[PDB]
Ligand binder design. Sequence first.
Ligand SMILES: COc1cc2c(Nc3ccc(NC(=O)c4ccccc4)cc3)ncnc2cc1OCCCN1CCOCC1
Lengths: 43, 269
Amino acid sequence: IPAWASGNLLTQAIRQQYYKPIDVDRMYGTIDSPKLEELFNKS
Amino acid sequence: KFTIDDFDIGRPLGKGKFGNVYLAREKQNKFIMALKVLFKSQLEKEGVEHQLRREIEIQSHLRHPNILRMYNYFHDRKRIYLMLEFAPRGELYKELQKHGRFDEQRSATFMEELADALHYCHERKVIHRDIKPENLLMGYKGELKIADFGWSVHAPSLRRRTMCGTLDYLPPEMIEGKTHDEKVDLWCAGVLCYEFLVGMPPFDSPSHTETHRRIVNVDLKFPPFLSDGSKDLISKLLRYHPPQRLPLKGVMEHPWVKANSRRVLPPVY
Ligand SMILES: COc1cc2c(Nc3ccc(NC(=O)c4ccccc4)cc3)ncnc2cc1OCCCN1CCOCC1
């Protein structure tokens, strides 16, 4: 378990993320998705 | 597009049927999320491919503070990965089990958050059909997050016929083989409120047939410690006739919810 993923390091990060939300709609929501029909196909 | 290498894997959060869920960090943004991994071969073998793509279609198009967000998804040779909102406080059912029952403040807050999320779904003709503690997670400040859409359906026109959900949560119309609509979720909200406050669902019985019987008779027996307000809300949701059930807006506006909810909306970008 890497340091960031436990104890005070995780808690700190989680709190920062709650109070400083990023634009997930642009950061991830705008990024291309594999078409649902191609999910069980080649990658 | 994303790949697994784009994430620091922290640790497993839970096991599932088709893969595990992991605490993960997206590297570029140092942004903490959950990564659900599903194995393509096991999904195909079990014959649940179209089930999964339905769940993904529904959840990936919902944006609400009380619905667990699916940011995106990707796949590689062997795996399908779902990038999900991390819910720091974990499983609501574990918290309920830990405490036995929730106090009125906790229960009322949850009910407001639930009614708001369900209203959002119904506005889009999505019926959930399996509201119960095990399908809810909790955010940083304990905010309810509808986490699982396993029985959910987009139902624009036709009323539905599938008996689904969980025994203790089934509405009379499902048990009786009638068609159902979005008002099934009103019933399940009433069952949920009762379970929040009592720690057991209202129609608890050792047999399927006795449970069925209590449901269709609405054999509701309120424990003495319940407030008049909580009983009022539950009674207004657990109506035999779907059209008589308190609407979701009605739950949000109910005086007991107003008086006891300490609901906080998460900061938005
Ligand atoms: C260990 O349970 C967790 C599960 C989580 C979790 N689990 C999910 C797994 C899968 C999932 N979606 C699907 O499986 C799925 C399947 C088909 C289509 C769409 C979604 C949603 C949520 N997501 C986000 N955050 C979570 C956070 C979780 O726990 C955080 C730890 C909380 N806490 C820490 C100390 O006190 C006790 C526990």
